[PDB]
């Protein structure tokens, strides 16, 4: 018998190779490191469990482990949100500094402790894409009402805003979009949404998708299987949930470009959202966290600490990195890439 | 096994030289020490400008280094680390692990005895130290310039004087004044090493190196000896590592380039004008090297058309985001 088999439920259809494709990329890094000898056995959402309950399942002990949002479990206590994402948080390469150099990985597991999880980062999918509408969203007015499915804590701020949000697992957005019981969606970026197929019904995807602009993509595991581990297996599964993590933003960095031009190809219509909607987005966040963070002293302590980071990043990131690739970007649209 | 790594980089490093250290222990610890690689920094076991070439000798079994370093053996050994108007940090490693490029790199690496994996990332690099400010090309004539890789040559079309000298090495030279000016990296490592004392001004963007990757480099015969299982674990670690690299950069550079505004850094931008200058003899050089050298042409042209996909779909979200908060950030608002 190998080692250790575990079972890892994972809260994405088996249908996206990026985000569901994460826990496989993990899997087979750690068969391939050990001859067999550690076993994770990956499913997708809805086979063993209900994919926005994957991490309960974890906390219960009925499975080992499951890669998940952590905003998925904003309803239990938002703190699950916050090395996830939450609106107007870092990029990946910002919130991966913060993880992995910053002491974010501590204390998101200080946290997670009490509800019997140790996680590690398991892939990012950089900034999102801003969803899928039937009609065009030139104001805030133009959200008012909309029946929209969104991801997380996002839900809070975008009921501020009038929209009603709705909390659908990745493969079941669809057929509610095609049967008109939600408005709009939004998922990730061009590669999945495109694989969803929402294009077919609403043709006007927005961006940016404010509400997350580097989501992090938890592999979570129960507290005690991951104790149980020898301290040879228990650095092996952190070292290759850290490749697996790069890997996902990888894979979705070479995919998106050429599936945003299949989009376009097929006459879906690409539209910012205006900087007015950013800034009354802004404001609407800003209140909830107000409130959050007052109320809640887990999520204060988090919070504080990405916000200390994310004003040195934002500063930072305007010298070299902007410069560079704006330049690049004129270039490219000028013709002489 | 019992591996020794030669390493191109100075031990105050623990970015860029730190990342061989990361490796070793990632690769120990995940074979209670079974797989140990000793971490030589640069000069130690060779000189850091020739960590490859040891490599390829079989003298070490395999090195941490920048494939620009070895333009000089052939310009295509540069081309998977960086050449000057490349792709970001994101974009090459899409390319690399997504695009072929670690087959495509290893395939031109073969004949060198030589295989590789991405070792690190250092993001954009900024724009070098200087004893005075420059505003035009002109400006730059004559300079003489410690600067990675093949941006010597493009260096060479704008009359600068360009030299390789490696990390540790560098900063002698810039204060008995054998150099006018030096790139290296970024604001954490350029503090380190001190050229802010000698060169206050610091430009940007580091048009040379806007992604340049930082390989673990491995003797053919010593990795193809390795069962299957270890040259797994050793890709799964190198890609780690890759990663671990650019996210301790992401973390350090804001502080850093504070610290050196504080110390009297002065801060400019490149001029539109020199930029476009710059890329212009790129462009020429690229034509020519891709017309003389099928093995550059090979590879140049699998990065050049994944360029134009990957900054045709960046200025889509990511700009629009990352803009939208810069600006918040400038307006006082985060
Ligand atoms: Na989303
Ligand atoms: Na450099």
Same mark, same amino acid.
């Given at each position: ?9 994972? =809260? ?43 991490? !309960? ?19 239990? !206590? ?10 107007? =948080? ?56 909309? *029946? ?7 839900? *809070? ?77 228990? =650095? ?24 945003? *031009? ?11 959202? =205006? ?25 204060? *302590?988090?919070? !504080? ?33």
């Amino acid at each position: 018998a190998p080692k250790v088999t575990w079972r890892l439920a994972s =809260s994405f259809p088996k249908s996206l190779d990026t985000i569901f494709g994460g826990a496989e990329v993990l899997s087979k890094m750690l068969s391939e490191a050990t001859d067999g000898n550690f076993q994770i056995q990956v499913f997708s959402a809805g086979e063993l469990v209900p994919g926005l309950q994957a991490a !309960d399942a974890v906390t219960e002990g009925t499975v080992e482990c499951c890669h998940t949002v952590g905003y998925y479990y904003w309803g239990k !206590d938002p703190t699950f949100a916050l090395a996830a994402a939450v609106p107007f =948080s870092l990029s990946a390469r910002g919130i991966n500094a913060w993880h992995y150099h910053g002491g974010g990985i501590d204390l998101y597991n200080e946290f997670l402790s009490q509800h019997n999880i140790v996680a590690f980062p398991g892939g990012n999918t950089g900034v999102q894409m801003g969803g899928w509408f039937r009609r065009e969203i030139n104001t805030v007015a133009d959200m008012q009402g909309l *029946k929209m499915r969104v991801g997380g804590f996002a839900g *809070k701020v975008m009921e501020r805003l009038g929209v009603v949000p709705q909390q659908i697992a990745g493969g079941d957005i669809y057929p509610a979009l095609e049967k008109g019981t939600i408005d709009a969606t939004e998922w990730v970026g061009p590669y999945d949404d495109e694989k969803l197929g929402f294009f077919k019904v609403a043709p006007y995807y927005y961006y940016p998708g404010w509400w997350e602009g580097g989501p992090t993509v938890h592999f979570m595991f129960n507290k005690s299987a991951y104790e149980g581990l020898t301290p040879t297996y228990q =650095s092996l599964l952190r070292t290759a949930c850290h490749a697996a993590d790069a890997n996902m933003l990888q894979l979705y960095d070479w995919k998106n470009p050429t599936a945003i *031009k299949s989009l376009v190809a097929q006459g879906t219509q690409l539209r910012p959202f =205006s900087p007015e909607i950013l800034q009354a987005c802004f404001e609407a966040a800003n209140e909830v966290y107000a409130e959050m963070e007052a109320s809640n002293p887990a999520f204060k *302590k988090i919070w !504080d600490s990405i916000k200390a980071f994310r004003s040195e990043h934002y500063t930072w990131a305007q010298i070299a990195e902007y410069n560079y690739d704006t330049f690049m970007m004129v270039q490219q649209n000028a013709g002489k890439l």
